[PDB]
Amino acid sequence: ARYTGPLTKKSRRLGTDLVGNDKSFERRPYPPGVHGRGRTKDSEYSLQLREKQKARYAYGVLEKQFRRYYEEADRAQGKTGDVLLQILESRLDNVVYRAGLAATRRQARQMVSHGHFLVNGKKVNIPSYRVSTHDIIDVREKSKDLPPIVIARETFETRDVPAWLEVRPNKGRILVHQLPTRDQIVIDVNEQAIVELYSK
């Protein structure tokens, strides 16, 4: 119920950097496997499916839960892709990643599932915990000196925190100013393509 295999293979297949940089993605222009350099047809399904899989492997969400997110966004009022990206960003592991306390979303999932975090006073070990507005995520007092935590404390200045979060790095406290908007989620997929895909 969690993808544990290599991520560079998925990034190469999907054609975009799922996470990180300056890595084995120097072989980017071609998917993994023996048949990587051949010319591709890329149907509309192919395109749509690529966008959906890009979002899925970026956020570490499997198909059933991603589908559930899709119906929630579709029911919600407003743009379906905007709401879907808003939900995926409101996931707690992504919140930790965006605040910059984790090197990657996989590391954020690791620490969240291991329970190194407090949500507004209550301990949460659910990576899919949907953080609500005005929430206060806190690092567990016992685990305020994790090696990944201190690496993040050394590196966060380079990292860019989105406008909808406030982070007290050394304190391990992520204040949620508001639930993010499409202009605030970084554009790296085609949510419109995903929405069109979930209609066929």
């Binding site: 509309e44 407003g78 743009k79 379906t80 905007d82 419109q192 929405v195 069109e196 209609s199």
Partner: protein, 115 residues
Amino acid sequence: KVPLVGRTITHPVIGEKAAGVVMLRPASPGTGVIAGGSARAVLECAGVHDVLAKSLGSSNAINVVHATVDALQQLEEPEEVARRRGKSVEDIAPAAMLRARKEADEAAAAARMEE
């Protein structure tokens, strides 16, 4: 030219050339191009981003394309509707449609200035 009231069709239409009937309806923003392959390609090239298109009649690609084409040609832009009726857009056309046109135009203004 195709009249778009803010990234979507102005009003529902039904076009038909030979035997290729294509139905088009406007959709709320974010709905996407819910259309079959040929009609969807026609709409995506025309620039419509929120539309519901159904293909009635024959499924031949050429005829379906012509039906989508004359369905779009049947579109009647609100200002020219007002000219037709000898009235004003505020007197003939829905306030929600006109408003959505203003927000589309202004968001367009934002994008242009940002360039």
